Design a protein around this nucleic acid. Structure first.
Lengths: 326, 338
DNA sequence: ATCCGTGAGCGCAGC
DNA sequence: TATAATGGGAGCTGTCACGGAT
């Protein structure tokens, strides 16, 4: 009632089903700009926070109509059977055929990996492909031009390309904004808000549409929100709507105002409705005494309190260590 | 949504399953990044954990709740390294990210593992949290050089974590896992007897079936330790109008009869000291510990009265005897002895 | 209109 | 410490009237 949130919306935030954004950080979803106190589903929060990266599977045996570094659009096909249902940059994934033309075809295997970019000039002795066994490692027989084909799949990421030749000043993971210098001492700058992923292989600083949106979940969001609320102000707004012709408008405004006035007259802060320190009842009032039979008997409160502690310290460790949000 | 199970299922059900090529790439990238952390730690001279966390911190963001200016300050040093040195920083960032992906994706196995560890005193979800916890350590140690698919080496930490948790969070009274294990084999060997004997094992049968150093006494003893407390709120009668704690007394707290008798005893005992001089009584007060609860030795009492222990000891005897005479005319204090 | 949550006698005994 | 192992498991059924929010 105070935050003008529905009970469903509350549940969603507390039980982690939808994010509530506290600062939009220049977020545009479906064209419409994002606002504070806005409920985002998981899929949406991802697009805005991380990006749009879809890999289309290529049936092993067919080559690629697209090449590494190229860009594709919706209505355009990666291979005869596979098309891209989106626009953006497309990257080869697990090319099965490396054919360096020595100014020769080499087979790729699951564990094998490549360390050279497509169209790279090579000489005898350099490193082109690696593997678990160096006895099975591929080397550079002579001067030749690198070429990779037959990728397992194509990741069509909606991102932008920022090639560089000098050292980068951005490490993968960082977020960027239009004009943000990325590398080459000012020469390489950003063209859009996004997330950077320096590709040392292709010496390319990629940026994927993404902002530092603050869309939190749980009581932490509700607690901050409650703390941000100014009781005096909300009273005013509700009073002005208490002057609205509609009967229901004035009714709801009165009820909200009753809660606000309660907090104002009492002096209690709405944030106290969120709990960070839980009390524990004196153990005598919830004991585990020994019966005449010699056995002990405990109150259900004890098993409830312990259940919380088990979950709390589990979370503290997991958080302190750091691990997937999921 | 109402069913948190289905919620985790959909949350991790959007994460695609990694193909051997994808798995090998990611797991490999993870390993490379961790070793890159080593090299970057050495070059920086910083604590390897700190730099691992500043890399991760950036990967996760300030969104995660070492003030953030620190991780920036470090990141400034990390980025003030030359091009070659920043290379390993970049790779380590990529590895921390691949770590996250590999975990997020290799979780459906954790479900398919914990579903058989249920009914052991912990719920599906509690167990899962434990299996995921161990999984992160397993991913941190998994090597693609072995060439065994992640499932193979992962299950070990997934089963160990849940099984350890069941032995750590299922008893109101914390009991060591090794003890739990003994108890488990006690029931295992017992049931074997029960099904073979066609009847019902005893302390002495299982004891011998268990092996050496195993007697009937030990069986019953172990069962006594295994005894679990019961709920005081347990229902009494078919009418749920009564509970266990209702029919359980208080033995600790002063019962009006007990407190009354103590008030009477101390009164009469004093009335007996009124039958002595304050020196005699005081001596007894300190010696017996009535003066201030603490009983004071004869040497201390002789330090108070400035008297040789022998004289203090003898007057204490004289005082006790005088009390005995007065008692031989009263015997009022004997009643309190009861 | 519908759905959710709220109450629905007191003892005694209850092995 | 390593064959590989990747969407769960059990449902409670013969009240009802009222005040409230949706």
């Amino acid at each position: 009632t105070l935050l003008d949130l529905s009970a469903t919306e509350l549940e969603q935030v507390l039980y982690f089903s939808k994010y509530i954004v506290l600062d939009p950080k220049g977020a545009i979803l479906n064209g419409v700009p994002v606002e504070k106190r806005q409920l985002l589903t998981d899929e949406e929060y991802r697009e805005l926070r991380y990006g749009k990266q879809e890999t289309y599977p290529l049936p092993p045996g067919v080559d690629a109509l697209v090449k590494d570094g190229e860009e594709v659009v919706k209505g355009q096909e990666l291979a005869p059977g596979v098309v891209s249902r989106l626009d953006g940059v497309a990257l080869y994934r697990f090319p099965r055929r490396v054919r360096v033309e020595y100014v020769k075809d080499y087979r790729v295997q699951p564990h094998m990996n490549v360390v050279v970019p497509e169209g790279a000039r090579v000489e005898a002795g350099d490193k082109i492909v690696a593997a678990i066994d160096p006895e099975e490692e591929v080397i550079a027989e002579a001067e030749g031009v690198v070429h990779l084909h037959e990728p397992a799949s194509i990741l069509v990421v909606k991102a932008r390309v920022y090639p560089f030749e000098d050292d980068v000043e951005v490490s993968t993971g960082d977020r960027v904004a239009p004009g943000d210098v990325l590398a080459d001492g000012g020469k390489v700058k950003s063209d859009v808000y996004g997330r950077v992923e320096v590709d040392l292989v292709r010496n390319v600083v990629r940026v994927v549409e993404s902002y530092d949106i603050d869309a939190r979940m749980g009581a932490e969001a509700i607690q901050q929100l409650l703390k941000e609320l100014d009781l005096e102000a909300l009273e005013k707004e509700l009073l002005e709507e208490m002057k609205h012709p509609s009967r229901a408008r004035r009714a709801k405004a009165r009820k909200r105002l009753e809660v606000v006035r309660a907090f104002l007259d009492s002096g209690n802060r709405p944030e106290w409705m969120i709990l960070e320190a839980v009390p524990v009842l004196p153990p005598d009032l919830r004991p585990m005494v020994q019966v005449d039979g010699g056995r002990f008997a405990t109150s259900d409160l004890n098993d409830l309190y312990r259940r919380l502690i088990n979950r709390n310290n589990r979370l503290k460790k997991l958080l302190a260590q750091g691990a997937p949000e999921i | 949504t109402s069913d948190p199970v289905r919620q985790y299922l959909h949350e991790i059900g959007q994460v695609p399953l990694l193909t051997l090529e994808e798995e090998v790439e990611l797991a490999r990238k993870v390993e490379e990044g961790m070793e890159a952390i080593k090299k970057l730690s050495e070059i920086t001279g910083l604590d390897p954990d700190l730099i691992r966390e500043v890399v991760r911190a950036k990967i996760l963001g300030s969104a995660r709740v070492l003030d953030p200016k620190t991780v920036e300050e470090i990141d400034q040093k990390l980025k003030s390294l030359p091009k070659e040195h920043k290379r390993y920083l970049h790779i380590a960032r990529e590895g921390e990210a691949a770590r996250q992906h590999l975990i997020e994706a290799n979780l459906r196995l954790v479900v398919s593992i914990a579903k058989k560890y249920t009914g052991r005193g912990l719920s599906f979800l509690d167990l899962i949290q434990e299996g995921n916890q161990g999984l992160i350590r397993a991913v941190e140690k998994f090597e693609y050089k072995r060439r065994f698919k992640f499932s193979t080496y992962a299950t070990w930490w997934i089963r160990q974590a849940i099984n350890r948790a069941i032995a750590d969070q299922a008893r109101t009274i914390r009991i060591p896992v090794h003890m739990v294990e003994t108890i488990n084999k006690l029931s295992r060997t017992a049931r074997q007897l029960q099904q073979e004997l066609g009847r019902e094992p005893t302390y002495e049968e299982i004891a011998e079936a268990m092996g050496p150093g195993w007697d009937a006494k030990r069986v019953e003893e172990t069962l006594k330790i295994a005894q679990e407390p019961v709920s005081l709120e347990t229902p009494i009668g078919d009418e749920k109008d009564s509970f266990y704690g209702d029919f359980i007394p208080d033995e600790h707290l002063p019962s009006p009869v007990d407190a009354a008798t103590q008030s009477l005893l101390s009164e009469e005992l004093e009335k007996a000291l009124s039958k002595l001089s304050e020196r005699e009584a005081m001596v007894l007060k300190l010696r017996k510990g009535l003066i201030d609860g603490r009983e004071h030795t004869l040497e201390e009492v002789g330090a108070f009265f400035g008297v040789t222990r022998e004289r203090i000891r003898q007057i204490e005897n004289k005082a006790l005897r005088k009390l005995k005479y007065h008692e031989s005319r009263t015997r009022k204090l004997r009643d309190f002895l009861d």
